[PDB]
Amino acid sequence: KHNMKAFLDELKAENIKKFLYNFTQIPHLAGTEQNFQLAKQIQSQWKEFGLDSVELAHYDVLLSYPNKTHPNYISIINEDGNEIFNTSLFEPPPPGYENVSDIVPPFSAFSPQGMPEGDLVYVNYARTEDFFKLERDMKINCSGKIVIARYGKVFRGNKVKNAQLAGAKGVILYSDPADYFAPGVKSYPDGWNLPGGGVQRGNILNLNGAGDPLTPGYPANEYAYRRGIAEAVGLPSIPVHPIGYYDAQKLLEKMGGSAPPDSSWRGSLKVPYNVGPGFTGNFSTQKVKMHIHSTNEVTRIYNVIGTLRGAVEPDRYVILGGHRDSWVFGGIDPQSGAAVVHEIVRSFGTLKKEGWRPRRTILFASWDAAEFGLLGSTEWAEENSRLLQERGVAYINADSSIEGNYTLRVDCTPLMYSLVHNLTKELKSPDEGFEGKSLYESWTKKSPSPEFSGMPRISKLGSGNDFEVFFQRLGIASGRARYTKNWETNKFSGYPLYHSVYETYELVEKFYDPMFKYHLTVAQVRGGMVFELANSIVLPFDCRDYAVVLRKYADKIYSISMKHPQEMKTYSVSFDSLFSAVKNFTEIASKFSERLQDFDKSNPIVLRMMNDQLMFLERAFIDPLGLPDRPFYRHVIYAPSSHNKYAGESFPGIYDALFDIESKVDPSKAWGEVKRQIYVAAFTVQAAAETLSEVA
Amino acid sequence: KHNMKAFLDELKAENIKKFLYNFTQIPHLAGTEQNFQLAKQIQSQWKEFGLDSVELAHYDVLLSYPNKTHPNYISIINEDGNEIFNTSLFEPPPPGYENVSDIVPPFSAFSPQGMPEGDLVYVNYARTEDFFKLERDMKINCSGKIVIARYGKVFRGNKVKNAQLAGAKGVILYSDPADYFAPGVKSYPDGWNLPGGGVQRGNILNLNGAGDPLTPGYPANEYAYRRGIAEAVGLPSIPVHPIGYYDAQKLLEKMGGSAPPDSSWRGSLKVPYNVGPGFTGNFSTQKVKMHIHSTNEVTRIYNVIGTLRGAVEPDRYVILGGHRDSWVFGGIDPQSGAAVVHEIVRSFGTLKKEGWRPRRTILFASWDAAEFGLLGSTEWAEENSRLLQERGVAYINADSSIEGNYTLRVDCTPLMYSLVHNLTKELKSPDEGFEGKSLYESWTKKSPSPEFSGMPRISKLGSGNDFEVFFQRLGIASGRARYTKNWETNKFSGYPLYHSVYETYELVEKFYDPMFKYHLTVAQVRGGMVFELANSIVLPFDCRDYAVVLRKYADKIYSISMKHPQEMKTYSVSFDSLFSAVKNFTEIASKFSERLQDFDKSNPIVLRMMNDQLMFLERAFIDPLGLPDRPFYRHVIYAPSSHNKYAGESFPGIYDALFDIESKVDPSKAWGEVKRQIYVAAFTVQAAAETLSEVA
Numbered sequence A, B: 001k002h003n004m005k006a007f008l009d010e011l012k013a014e015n016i017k018k019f020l021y022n023f024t025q026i027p028h029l030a031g032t033e034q035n036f037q038l039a040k041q042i043q044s045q046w047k048e049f050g051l052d053s054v055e056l057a058h059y060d061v062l063l064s065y066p067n068k069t070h071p072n073y074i075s076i077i078n079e080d081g082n083e084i085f086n087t088s089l090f091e092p093p094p095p096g097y098e099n100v101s102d103i104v105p106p107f108s109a110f111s112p113q114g115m116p117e118g119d120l121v122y123v124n125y126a127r128t129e130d131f132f133k134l135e136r137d138m139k140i141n142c143s144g145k146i147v148i149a150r151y152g153k154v155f156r157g158n159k160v161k162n163a164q165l166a167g168a169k170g171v172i173l174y175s176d177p178a179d180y181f182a183p184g185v186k187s188y189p190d191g192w193n194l195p196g197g198g199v200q201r202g203n204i205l206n207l208n209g210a211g212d213p214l215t216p217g218y219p220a221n222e223y224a225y226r227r228g229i230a231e232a233v234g235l236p237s238i239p240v241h242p243i244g245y246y247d248a249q250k251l252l253e254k255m256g257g258s259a260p261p262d263s264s265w266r267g268s269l270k271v272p273y274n275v276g277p278g279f280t281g282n283f284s285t286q287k288v289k290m291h292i293h294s295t296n297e298v299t300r301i302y303n304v305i306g307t308l309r310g311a312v313e314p315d316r317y318v319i320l321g322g323h324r325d326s327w328v329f330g331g332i333d334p335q336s337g338a339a340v341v342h343e344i345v346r347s348f349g350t351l352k353k354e355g356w357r358p359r360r361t362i363l364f365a366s367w368d369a370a371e372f373g374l375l376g377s378t379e380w381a382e383e384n385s386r387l388l389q390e391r392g393v394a395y396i397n398a399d400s401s402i403e404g405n406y407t408l409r410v411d412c413t414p415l416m417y418s419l420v421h422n423l424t425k426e427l428k429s430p431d432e433g434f435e436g437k438s439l440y441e442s443w444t445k446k447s448p449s450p451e452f453s454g455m456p457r458i459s460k461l462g463s464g465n466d467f468e469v470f471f472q473r474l475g476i477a478s479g480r481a482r483y484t485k486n487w488e489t490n491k492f493s494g495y496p497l498y499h500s501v502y503e504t505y506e507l508v509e510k511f512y513d514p515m516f517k518y519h520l521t522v523a524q525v526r527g528g529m530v531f532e533l534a535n536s537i538v539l540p541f542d543c544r545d546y547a548v549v550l551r552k553y554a555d556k557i558y559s560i561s562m563k564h565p566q567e568m569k570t571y572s573v574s575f576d577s578l579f580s581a582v583k584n585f586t587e588i589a590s591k592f593s594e595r596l597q598d599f600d601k602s603n604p605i606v607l608r609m610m611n612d613q614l615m616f617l618e619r620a621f622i623d624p625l626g627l628p629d630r631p632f633y634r635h636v637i638y639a640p641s642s643h644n645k646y647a648g649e650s651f652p653g654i655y656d657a658l659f660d661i662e663s664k665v666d667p668s669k670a671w672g673e674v675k676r677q678i679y680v681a682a683f684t685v686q687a688a689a690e691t692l693s694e695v696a
């Protein structure tokens, strides 16, 4: 038989290991020759594996690189203009790689050039709430200061946006051991912790889903008209540079001014964590000086796109995509995902060689330039948006397969909840103590959902990865799955060696997954989801699961508003329309589910009419006018949080209209906008409900 | 047999006559009780006729009405403040209707209130080119003046926009006999010409496709959040009022200042057509004073929506829609169309009663408030936009069936050209001298296409009627057909009694179509188009016809740009990408047509996959970012002209970027924007082409 079990059984941990080794011996930075050569290798291999067509889709997009002959660094400068301390020019390379060329030194991609000098203010995580605390409670003014912030909690681009709007002239980002050094584990190469010379790379753009900063809306093809740099989307206006904790220690140790407001502002270094501004008495005349000389450059990038044509519905696409570009070796990010995609393609190809084809078309993607703002996936989706919004069934992401070895993590649309539950009940748990038990059993035990008995946690989708354009712009049902850690307060912080030179094959093989069993389990989940989406006669989406969550999100947004009962009375702010819409959605989804179970099965038009209702249900949550000042975030139920791109927010338009509303100067206008957002959300939920009604 | 011939043969001229009489005995102004009662009658009748469901869809939208106890008028005022001449308070009613109540007097809907007094400037048709002539050539300054303009040539809302931006404080619109009095024909009631007391009503909004001015983007339902009036969309900022030619004569006869620049500025009245400003010496101290007291009021409107469920593809909609609201009796506009829709529904219902159903679902619509800005169609399309863009096959409009008795007029998407040619070859010509000949033969003889031998003229779609939201916002293939006059320079001016109290049943029965043969022919064309769209196995769209027109439009826009060869050299302005896209579209459409003719006919999935490619081809020309500053006009190939809503423009984004470009202060920026629009158009044409490629 060619069934899901045949597909799953063909996947091998040993192949995933071999591929991961193959993908991680040299750097594959976006826009470099080494990453083009890897694209060509993957293209050739996917052809050999059996795909019907495998093409490169290239674009010319804005990238950012340090200047090789004018390196980035930070100094402490004395009154004479002597630089008495300098931060490192590179991370000490790991054992056996000290002679590898073309390791890009740590930098913040898309930082502008400059050499700002001034006094430091320490801003904790540079979160919205941290800047509120500084400014409103502590009366500390960031204007004209260099801010030093610890990485963690939220996306670094939000930190830099928050610093900019506070008036900062520069941002120094550093990794505090509190957030990146797990107790009782050795630093790399002797364990998986971050050494004091390690540094987290990463872009600091605020693109809000636009893709290439020069061509918002349209693919960056050969005849593209480009914005001038001054009109580009998302570029930071102040210099930014990341450092490790040995260097941070030298910068923080002299800090004066005000004490930290409380212990949530103190990291683990042996410094006071004084907020500043500036240094203590003896060193009051010293300043900090940045030297940033990186350049932005339009550069060719290459996606690999493989097609396995459907036998019955070739005009319906199930997409498995993940990126290929890395900051350095990409041992976890992204090659632990790319190796899993490679083995999934090989397995599907084995079935294809035996005469099988999936019911629907499967597209496989190796995206480029994800590290520079999801550029490859976004430009391709812009090029192909008409095909995707009329034919796109689902997108399954495949960045890193592991960020820990504790349990499964799944973030996806409610439409995929039942698919994931059913699939995980059929897979073996790889966990110690759960031999002979299902993955569903181990996952549910280790990661219980807050609301339900005997149910696992599934998170919402925001941004930070290549599902963003498919889900948030185009409204295609999307999902992701990986193995994760236990550490809840570190959820959005990354694993310790994230985006460092230390992220290697050895890191994974020695410390995370020696048997490649967690990688194999993740391959089974991602591959199984793709298999069911591409082969099930009826699409495996349960609209009733959306009805359940919409009521939870309505209760939640109502509770936020109800912090302000007087204003709700004054401005007649009613959530009645939203609850009515959710009630109607619940009722109509229940009836649709009855018809889906009961319709005449011999009738392919009723089936496909029904399959189209399922497919276009996620699409119905798209508003073609987008969210306020964010035209490329169009999903009305989910958006990336306006305070943290990594986090999904529910009913974001209402949430943002309510956020900090007590501080708005014109409460009538602010509450008017809350009421407008309630109307848009109620309307969108009712309109989505009506797509599931009988069609005529 | 239940075939198209059975449907067509059931249509009767006598029924259309009876319905027209029934719909035109009393006024049916939008938002009034009489129009709600007609909606209920139509709902009941469509049910009796056999439709599966017939519902009212209501909305609460901004409408505009004169004040019944404070009438609108214009005066000539002397230096003492004596009003020595006043314009009429109503049109003399036609014979037999002098005791009909609730005839709304002539007014410009959505005029603000005011009583501006000042000196007149005569602005010809108030076209863009007329204001260029005044300001740039004649050095006449409209600022603070009351402008008097003759109706004709372009939509009156464009006249008022042009007057506003020229600085005018008021606009008087009048009907010149040059434009509304055909030589050798008697005035109503003794012929079809406009009497000197007749007045053309009409709204003067500039909504750019938004619908209700208070709820752009979203249906004006019971929980809608409404813009405040100050933020409303499209409202004029200066008072406006229409008058007839007896009253215009009294206003123009004293005009002084500069002579008309040439004979194209002179109408037919026995006045000098002096441009002004102000009156000649003896009356130099007299002014003109407007008195406008109309009010804008949120008012309930009602669409009737009838469904005839498809037997095979009930989730595919073919829509026949036209409006029901009239300014007064609506003898031509819209009841000559509504009567034809009524007879089409009755005929389809006769087949349904015998056991027939169409293959696809047919929706029939009686729209409200079209005269106030296409409000009914637009709010309904906003409510149902997700259903329409995933399921909408085609929209056929059905406003007035006649505006003359000379020949057929068809405006439609290229996708419908072959359908219209084939259908008209099978219908009988109603014309004198063409008995026994086809409608195609008479039409092609009377209205030859400029480019082709033995082909009829078909025009482009702009706005001005209820197809606008379906075609320009949502990208659903649309068409319209009616009988028309010979008068080419009057094409956008209306027939003489347009929007006057004289537009009655008697006008039609005595002067336009005594035998109702032209109405029957129009019923055959509109009904036949609906029949073929709802019943043909393969959708009757020919993508190759789009390829032909796209090359014509590319040649045309290139020729406009080539008026400026130096600038094209300087700014490197290349149309190569657009021609390449059009070439690719031509090639891919040809191959798709081969597959369509040759595909396995026993295969319903390939058929429907192919039918979906046909259906989504018009959809592919939509840009989700819309046209510049016009978010609700989203079709990249067509938009309503920015100078005349009635006219369609091709490649509007490039056309507007080039328009008057020699006058722009920053040529680098202006030519940059031309290049941007070329890129967007080339990309959109290539993306539409690619929807017709093999799907995988």
Ligand SMILES: *[C@@H]1O[C@H](CO)[C@@H](O[C@@H]2O[C@H](CO)[C@@H](O[C@@H]3O[C@H](CO)[C@@H](O)[C@H](O[C@H]4O[C@H](CO)[C@@H](O)[C@H](O)[C@@H]4O)[C@@H]3O)[C@H](O)[C@H]2NC(C)=O)[C@H](O)[C@H]1NC(C)=O
Pocket: A577, A578, A580, A581, A584, A682, A683, A686, B222
């Ligand atoms: C959830 O689905 C239900 C359908 O099961 C749907 O109920 C609809 O609610 C609307 C708005 O509440 C109802 O609107 C009424 O329609 C009648 C005509 O049928 C009008 O006469 C009513 O207007 C009068 O009363 C208003 C309220 O006091 C006044 O403001 C107004 O000026 C009039 O005096 C009113 O428009 C509609 O009939 C039902 N439809 C049904 C029951 O089938 C509900 O809207 C859905 N929820 C959402 C968010 O869409």
Ligand SMILES: *[C@@H]1O[C@H](CO)[C@@H](O[C@@H]2O[C@H](CO)[C@@H](O[C@@H]3O[C@H](CO)[C@@H](O)[C@H](O[C@H]4O[C@H](CO)[C@@H](O)[C@H](O)[C@@H]4O)[C@@H]3O)[C@H](O)[C@H]2NC(C)=O)[C@H](O)[C@H]1NC(C)=O
Pocket: A222, B577, B578, B580, B581, B584, B682, B683, B686
């Ligand atoms: C109409 O359809 C045709 C396909 O039949 C399609 O042709 C494509 O044109 C593009 C752009 O002209 C070609 O792009 C080239 O791709 C190769 C790799 O295949 C690149 O090496 C080329 O880049 C080099 O040369 C450029 C131009 O001098 C330089 O600017 C650049 O820096 C590089 O040095 C270039 O990108 C593409 O290969 C073809 N595809 C084919 C022939 O299959 C055409 O684009 C379509 N029209 C539209 C409007 O889409």
Ligand SMILES: *[C@@H]1O[C@H](CO)[C@@H](O[C@@H]2O[C@H](CO)[C@@H](O)[C@H](O)[C@H]2NC(C)=O)[C@H](O)[C@H]1NC(C)=O
Pocket: A021, A022, A023, A025, A040, A041, A044, A045
């Ligand atoms: C990664 O694996 C690929 C695929 O086997 C290797 O590329 C092949 O290398 C051999 C020997 O140089 C060539 O003959 C083949 O043509 C290559 N095949 C391709 C590119 O498809 C590559 O050497 C491996 N890389 C590493 C670092 O081990």
Ligand SMILES: *[C@@H]1O[C@H](CO)[C@@H](O[C@@H]2O[C@H](CO)[C@@H](O)[C@H](O)[C@H]2NC(C)=O)[C@H](O)[C@H]1NC(C)=O
Pocket: A081, A082, A083, A084, A085, A086
């Ligand atoms: C930090 O780096 C800077 C730049 O390399 C050093 O300053 C330079 O030192 C050389 C050699 O004496 C001078 O000729 C240059 O003029 C200096 N460049 C400057 C000030 O921009 C500095 O000495 C280093 N500091 C430490 C502690 O190593």
Ligand SMILES: *[C@@H]1O[C@H](CO)[C@@H](O[C@@H]2O[C@H](CO)[C@@H](O)[C@H](O)[C@H]2NC(C)=O)[C@H](O)[C@H]1NC(C)=O
Pocket: A418, A419, A422, A539, A540, A541, A542, A597
């Ligand atoms: C997940 O599995 C459950 C249990 O098998 C599926 O629910 C059953 O679906 C079948 C077929 O429609 C019904 O006959 C049963 O009554 C359902 N049992 C229930 C709800 O307990 C469910 O459809 C699967 N979900 C998918 C495939 O998305």
Ligand SMILES: *[C@@H]1O[C@H](CO)[C@@H](O[C@@H]2O[C@H](CO)[C@@H](O)[C@H](O)[C@H]2NC(C)=O)[C@H](O)[C@H]1NC(C)=O
Pocket: B021, B022, B023, B025, B040, B041, B044, B045
């Ligand atoms: C237009 O035609 C309709 C339909 O025949 C007429 O409405 C009917 O009038 C009779 C007598 O008053 C009633 O018994 C019916 O119930 C009505 N039917 C409806 C509304 O569906 C209406 O009288 C005609 N109007 C004119 C001006 O002739």
Ligand SMILES: *[C@@H]1O[C@H](CO)[C@@H](O[C@@H]2O[C@H](CO)[C@@H](O)[C@H](O)[C@H]2NC(C)=O)[C@H](O)[C@H]1NC(C)=O
Pocket: B081, B082, B083, B084, B085, B086
């Ligand atoms: C034009 O209409 C106005 C308004 O009705 C007339 O002016 C009014 O005349 C009455 C009666 O004498 C006065 O009491 C009012 O004060 C006037 N209203 C004004 C000036 O606003 C005017 O006489 C009419 N002119 C003609 C030629 O008929």
Ligand SMILES: *[C@@H]1O[C@H](CO)[C@@H](O[C@@H]2O[C@H](CO)[C@@H](O)[C@H](O)[C@H]2NC(C)=O)[C@H](O)[C@H]1NC(C)=O
Pocket: B418, B419, B422, B539, B540, B541, B542, B597
């Ligand atoms: C209009 O009529 C023409 C002539 O009948 C149709 O063109 C024919 O279509 C059939 C069926 O595919 C082909 O076998 C013939 O070769 C075509 N003849 C031609 C192109 O001369 C055409 O399809 C009709 N257009 C519609 C229905 O939109």
Ligand SMILES: *[C@@H]1O[C@H](CO)[C@@H](O)[C@H](O)[C@H]1NC(C)=O
Pocket: A067, A068, A069, A070, A295
């Ligand atoms: C890198 O550094 C030096 C110093 O400005 C300069 O010569 C060179 O142009 C720079 N490279 C760039 C800006 O790409």
Ligand SMILES: *[C@@H]1O[C@H](CO)[C@@H](O)[C@H](O)[C@H]1NC(C)=O
Pocket: A141, A142, A143, A144
């Ligand atoms: C911060 O400091 C600068 C002084 O240079 C001042 O212009 C700015 O308004 C200050 N902001 C606050 C909140 O005090």
Ligand SMILES: *[C@@H]1O[C@H](CO)[C@@H](O)[C@H](O)[C@H]1NC(C)=O
Pocket: A192, A404, A405, A485, A511, A512
């Ligand atoms: C793998 O799991 C073990 C057992 O819980 C733990 O001690 C170790 O730290 C884990 N490794 C990583 C990288 O999380």
Ligand SMILES: *[C@@H]1O[C@H](CO)[C@@H](O)[C@H](O)[C@H]1NC(C)=O
Pocket: B067, B068, B069, B070, B295
């Ligand atoms: C109509 O006219 C009079 C004069 O202002 C006034 O009493 C009444 O309010 C007006 N009606 C309106 C504005 O609807």
Ligand SMILES: *[C@@H]1O[C@H](CO)[C@@H](O)[C@H](O)[C@H]1NC(C)=O
Pocket: B141, B142, B143, B144
């Ligand atoms: C028209 O007249 C007014 C004088 O009130 C002036 O402000 C305006 O600039 C003038 N425009 C031109 C083009 O002369």
Ligand SMILES: *[C@@H]1O[C@H](CO)[C@@H](O)[C@H](O)[C@H]1NC(C)=O
Pocket: B192, B404, B405, B485, B511, B512
């Ligand atoms: C109808 O046609 C005749 C013959 O051409 C013409 O004399 C008459 O003016 C027409 N009527 C109208 C309303 O156009």
Ligand SMILES: [Ca+2]
Pocket: A210, A211, A212, A214, A215, A216, A217, A218, A219, A220, A378, A379, A382
């Ligand atoms: Ca782009």
Ligand SMILES: [Ca+2]
Pocket: B210, B211, B212, B214, B215, B216, B217, B218, B219, B220, B378, B379, B382
């Ligand atoms: Ca609206």
